[PDB]
Amino acid sequence: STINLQKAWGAARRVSKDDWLEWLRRLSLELLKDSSSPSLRSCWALAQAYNPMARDLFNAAFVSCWSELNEDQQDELIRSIELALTSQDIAEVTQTLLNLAEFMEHSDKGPLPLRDDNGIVLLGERAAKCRAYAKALHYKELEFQKGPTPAILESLISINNKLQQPEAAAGVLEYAMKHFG
Amino acid sequence: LNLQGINESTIPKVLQYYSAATEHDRSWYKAWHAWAVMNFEAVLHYKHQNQARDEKKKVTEDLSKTLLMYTVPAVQGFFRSISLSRGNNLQDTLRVLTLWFDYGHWPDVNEALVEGVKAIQIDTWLQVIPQLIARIDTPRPLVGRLIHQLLTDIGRYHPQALIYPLTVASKSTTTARHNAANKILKNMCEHSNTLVQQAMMVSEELIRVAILWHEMWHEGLEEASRLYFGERNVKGMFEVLEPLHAMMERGPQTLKETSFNQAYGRDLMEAQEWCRKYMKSGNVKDLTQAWDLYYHVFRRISKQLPQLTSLELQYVSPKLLMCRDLELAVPGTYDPNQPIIRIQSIAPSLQVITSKQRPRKLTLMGSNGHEFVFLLKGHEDLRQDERVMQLFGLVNTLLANDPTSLRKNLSIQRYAVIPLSTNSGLIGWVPHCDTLHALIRDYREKKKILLNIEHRIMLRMAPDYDHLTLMQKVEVFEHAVNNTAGDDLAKLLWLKSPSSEVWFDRRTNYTRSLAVMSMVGYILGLGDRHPSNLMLDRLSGKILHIDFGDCFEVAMTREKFPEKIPFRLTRMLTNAMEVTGLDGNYRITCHTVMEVLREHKDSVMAVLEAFVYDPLLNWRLMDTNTALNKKAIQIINRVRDKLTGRDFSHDDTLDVPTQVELLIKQATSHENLCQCYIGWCPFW
Amino acid sequence: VGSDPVILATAGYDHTVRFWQAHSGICTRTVQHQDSQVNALEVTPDRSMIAAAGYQHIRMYDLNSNNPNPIISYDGVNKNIASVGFHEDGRWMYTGGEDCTARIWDLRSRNLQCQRIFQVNAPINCVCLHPNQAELIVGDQSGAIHIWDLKTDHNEQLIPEPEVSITSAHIDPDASYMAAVNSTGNCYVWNLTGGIGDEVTQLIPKTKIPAHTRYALQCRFSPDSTLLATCSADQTCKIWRTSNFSLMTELSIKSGNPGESSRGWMWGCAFSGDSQYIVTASSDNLARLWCVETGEIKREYGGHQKAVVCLAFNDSV
Ligand SMILES: Nc1ncnc2c1ncn2[C@@H]1O[C@H](COP(=O)(O)OP(=O)(O)NP(=O)(O)O)[C@@H](O)[C@H]1O
Ligand SMILES: [Mg+2]
Numbered sequence A: 001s002t003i004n005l006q007k008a009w010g011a012a013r014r015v016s017k018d019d020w021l022e023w024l025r026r027l028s029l030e031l032l033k034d035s036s037s038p039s040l041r042s043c044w045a046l047a048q049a050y051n052p053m054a055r056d057l058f059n060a061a062f063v064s065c066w067s068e069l070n071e072d073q074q075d076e077l078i079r080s081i082e083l084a085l086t087s088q089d090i091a092e093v094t095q096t097l098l099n100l101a102e103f104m105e106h107s108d109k110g111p112l113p114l115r116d117d118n119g120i121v122l123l124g125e126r127a128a129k130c131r132a133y134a135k136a137l138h139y140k141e142l143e144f145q146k147g148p149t150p151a152i153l154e155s156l157i158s159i160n161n162k163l164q165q166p167e168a169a170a171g172v173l174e175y176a177m178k179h180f181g
Numbered sequence B: 001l002n003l004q005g006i007n008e009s010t011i012p013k014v015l016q017y018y019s020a021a022t023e024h025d026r027s028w029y030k031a032w033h034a035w036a037v038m039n040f041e042a043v044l045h046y047k048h049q050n051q052a053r054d055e056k057k058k059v060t061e062d063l064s065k066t067l068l069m070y071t072v073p074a075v076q077g078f079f080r081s082i083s084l085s086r087g088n089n090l091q092d093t094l095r096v097l098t099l100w101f102d103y104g105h106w107p108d109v110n111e112a113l114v115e116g117v118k119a120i121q122i123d124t125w126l127q128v129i130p131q132l133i134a135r136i137d138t139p140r141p142l143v144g145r146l147i148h149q150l151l152t153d154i155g156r157y158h159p160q161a162l163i164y165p166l167t168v169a170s171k172s173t174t175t176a177r178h179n180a181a182n183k184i185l186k187n188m189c190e191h192s193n194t195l196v197q198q199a200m201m202v203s204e205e206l207i208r209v210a211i212l213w214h215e216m217w218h219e220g221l222e223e224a225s226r227l228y229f230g231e232r233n234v235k236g237m238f239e240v241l242e243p244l245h246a247m248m249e250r251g252p253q254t255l256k257e258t259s260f261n262q263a264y265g266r267d268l269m270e271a272q273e274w275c276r277k278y279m280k281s282g283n284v285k286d287l288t289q290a291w292d293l294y295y296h297v298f299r300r301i302s303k304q305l306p307q308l309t310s311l312e313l314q315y316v317s318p319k320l321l322m323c324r325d326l327e328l329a330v331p332g333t334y335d336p337n338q339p340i341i342r343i344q345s346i347a348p349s350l351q352v353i354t355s356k357q358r359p360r361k362l363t364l365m366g367s368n369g370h371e372f373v374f375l376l377k378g379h380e381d382l383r384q385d386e387r388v389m390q391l392f393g394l395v396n397t398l399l400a401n402d403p404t405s406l407r408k409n410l411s412i413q414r415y416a417v418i419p420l421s422t423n424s425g426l427i428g429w430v431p432h433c434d435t436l437h438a439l440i441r442d443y444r445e446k447k448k449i450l451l452n453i454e455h456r457i458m459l460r461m462a463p464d465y466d467h468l469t470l471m472q473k474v475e476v477f478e479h480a481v482n483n484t485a486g487d488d489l490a491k492l493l494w495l496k497s498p499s500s501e502v503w504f505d506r507r508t509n510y511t512r513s514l515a516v517m518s519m520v521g522y523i524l525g526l527g528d529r530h531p532s533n534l535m536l537d538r539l540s541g542k543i544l545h546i547d548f549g550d551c552f553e554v555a556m557t558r559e560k561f562p563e564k565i566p567f568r569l570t571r572m573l574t575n576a577m578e579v580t581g582l583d584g585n586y587r588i589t590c591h592t593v594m595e596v597l598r599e600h601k602d603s604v605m606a607v608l609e610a611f612v613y614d615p616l617l618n619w620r621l622m623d624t625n626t627a628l629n630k631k632a633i634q635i636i637n638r639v640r641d642k643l644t645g646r647d648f649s650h651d652d653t654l655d656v657p658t659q660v661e662l663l664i665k666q667a668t669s670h671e672n673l674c675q676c677y678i679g680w681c682p683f684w
Numbered sequence C: 001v002g003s004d005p006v007i008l009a010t011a012g013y014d015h016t017v018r019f020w021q022a023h024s025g026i027c028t029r030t031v032q033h034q035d036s037q038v039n040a041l042e043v044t045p046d047r048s049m050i051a052a053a054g055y056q057h058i059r060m061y062d063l064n065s066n067n068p069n070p071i072i073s074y075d076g077v078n079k080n081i082a083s084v085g086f087h088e089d090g091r092w093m094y095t096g097g098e099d100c101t102a103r104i105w106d107l108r109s110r111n112l113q114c115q116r117i118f119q120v121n122a123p124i125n126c127v128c129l130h131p132n133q134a135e136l137i138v139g140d141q142s143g144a145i146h147i148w149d150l151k152t153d154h155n156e157q158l159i160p161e162p163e164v165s166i167t168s169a170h171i172d173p174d175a176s177y178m179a180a181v182n183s184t185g186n187c188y189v190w191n192l193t194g195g196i197g198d199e200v201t202q203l204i205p206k207t208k209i210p211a212h213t214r215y216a217l218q219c220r221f222s223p224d225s226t227l228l229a230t231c232s233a234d235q236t237c238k239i240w241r242t243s244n245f246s247l248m249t250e251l252s253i254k255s256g257n258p259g260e261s262s263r264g265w266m267w268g269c270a271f272s273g274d275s276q277y278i279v280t281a282s283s284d285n286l287a288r289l290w291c292v293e294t295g296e297i298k299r300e301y302g303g304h305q306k307a308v309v310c311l312a313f314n315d316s317v
């Protein structure tokens, strides 16, 4: 359990993209080592052997171990994840972390408390930088549903243009102008 | 015409111009079509004159050469234009078909048809067969003879296309229809041997399977109990039981018929004898005894058939259970030009769907090895729906004619309709088809949300909400709507999606489908479709409609909890739509659909004229309102008014955006929604 | 009940018409109209009799008695009935609602046979009665007001806002006047003086009165022809003076805290006695006596279970 944090705390020592990939791999392997389900504790050895089995099973073992970890330990792992997100722009690690965020948003347990407002800013930004333009649109619409803001409306217009749908951009602009100046 | 219109002083001038264009290029289909259509429009204008003067026979006879002077060349030009085009030619063919049906007593039209129908390809006549078998050998020999000739001609090329429609038609009660069916079917058996007989066997077996003796007696004894116990109509009760008693007397043919006779028929015969003794002796105690017996039989059958789940074909149809490689096209097929799929076999039993109504889920394996699923059902008039699907095909073709609607894939989702005789038939089962009401229930149940919360809020404020005034209802309704968040379907749209991209695409297709269906619903006369009849696709998210009901502008006649607006966009739908709501994509789609309708208003008017004109279907419009033929003419006039922007501002010309905005503002009328039936759950 | 002048008649959806002293809040007796909700109430100038209009009933009771037993009693048309009214001479009662046919039912009758019928537009939302024996105002769902002569079915049609339905219309004393409010609620006032013939004349457009209304519910007059009042579908009532038709005061039942907001719509208004007091009500089951030109709420009556609506009251004995 706590071992999973020890690799996670390694996020405070990674700089290069290969270093962050190694961090994700080692965290995946240790998550597999002490998974609640024996079907993953058995696959720990194979994940060490191959590598991509650690990637595929990273979400599954992460969910169970994070569930077992208490509030402080969960917050520590979350801070490690936030260091990874705010440190370097890596499509693979960022997309994997965004997938974790998506599952936790969908799952009844609630989203990861990655930062303030669940990192809906950062997540959206990352979804724009990893070219997941629809993902960034979803995060920007989560911001929108709290209330219309000129920055939010302009960001939606930009994302709609980025999604090659001028119709949505025009409609968003019309809504913005009718609602406010 | 754009400077003058069509009238007596303008017809020959424009006809001369079109004829000159034809002479300069006789190979140009557009000029021939223009000349024929101008002659048809002249026929319509002189018909307007005929109705203006005759309604205030001599005028009709006087115009019987003026109208022929355009009708005969209209018919001939339509024939030549049809010979010069394919696919869209059916439109021109329809322009012929309705026209001479209205003028099917003049001999010149008969000569023109008899010589000109041979300029049409028979494969395109195949698309006309239903409206031929509706009018074959009716009391108008100049029409009936030609229709019989046409159907016999069709039989020489594609008899399989005629076997099913004529097999259904032969069960019509009319003597002439039955006998004409016999003649054409013999002329077909000259080519196909006994495939007519095989199809008749299959149809009869399916008809018997669709409704058991248990179910026929269930309905009949419910009516008998109502009449004797409710109305005290002894004579009506005996009238209802008379054919039912006759069926029981005739004896069984299958294991469930025999089982019914063993279980219920033995007692039902005693009740029958008591009724017979009353009707010659006056023993009302015998009526009470027979009625109580019928009551017990009815309750026993009602308790017997929630188990009607697995219907074994052995006990209702040994013939069909031992189905073999019958050279019969699979129902729902076929393209004549292609490798027609023959029926290999069917599953040993049927799955019945549990509801107030009990369709049978039939599974069939054809020559290509594929499975085809169908919904057999009785007590159901499917000709209406078949015409509605033809109209959907019309609209889909119109959208396919627009490059905007080709790059933006707009189309109405279609499915099979296969009527059988005696108000029954095979509908067709569509996979991944989910009721919107059931989807909201799914979300609420998975999150432990009570389903009737909105209605409970309404009734807490007003336990007697129904008998309130308009503003009282609006107060209670708006308070309840403010006290709820009708956004379940948006959450399910997000949750059921695997990824953000699929969610985005499904939302786009969803909104486009909503816009297209709302506009088509207003124009074609949508109305009576509760959320139960409103279905969703699991893959595309596009909306489907299974019940068509009275949606021909007559469902608007309702007064007991209407149906005040032909169409509706609910709060739940807008909540699942984009951030823009109406703005952007939805309004653009509505404008595009209305533009397609306006531009091709002539085709839509002709097809709706075809539907409204046919007496067999037109007689069913007397269930609602009004001189039936005059109301039919009025309905076509209102169709033109909607297709010319004259529905909200009759004494004006509504532009496309003007009419769209007026329709939107009608749909925003929450005051109408408070009055409407709660089946359309108004809080969503 | 009818023997005490300051009694106010109140009723809601809960099938009970209560009678309570205006200046004290003390309820005296009740009446039962279990057929349907109240669409309208009225206290006769005849001194005395009760009317209550609801779905398929004009229930008429004996206002003087401590038990107001039924009078005629209707048991009216088979459609929703909205309005009421008693003539000042002990003459016919007037019934509206759907269908487009105004029914006339005598007070002295003891059966369901109608005495006269008048032609109207879309179902009647309101009826009001002049002291004149040959004038009667009706407001319809079509946005059209209709005068008729009470004797000959000679009528005048008025439509001040055709696309906006009219809900309440009333008179002023000194006979021939008219005021009305509609689905926008921007009140209109005309002078009807005067004449009977093939058309009942003459409408004289006097003024338009801007009530703070998004949908108006009821507008009524003062016995002394000094005041008018109107009620909005949102949370307010308003008062003007007849001499200049300029805004005197207002009642705002919408608290500053959003938690108590949308307590109910302001159903019904009229004045009682001197030009100082006014009776109104809300659908939160609160019938209210407050002041003219002052806005001070004096008495509040929470004696009902379901949505008080369209008050009526006595003024004298
Ligand atoms: N193409 C279809 N695909 C899937 N389910 C269908 C389809 N058509 C009908 N149903 C389902 O079976 C039920 C409808 O049965 P049905 O007897 O056709 O209704 P109905 O009341 O008879 N319609 P109508 O007679 O026109 O008013 C519903 O529960 C549907 O979910
Ligand atoms: Mg049916």
Ligand SMILES: [Mg+2]
Residues within 6 Å of the ligand: B377, B380, B427
């Ligand atoms: Mg059906």
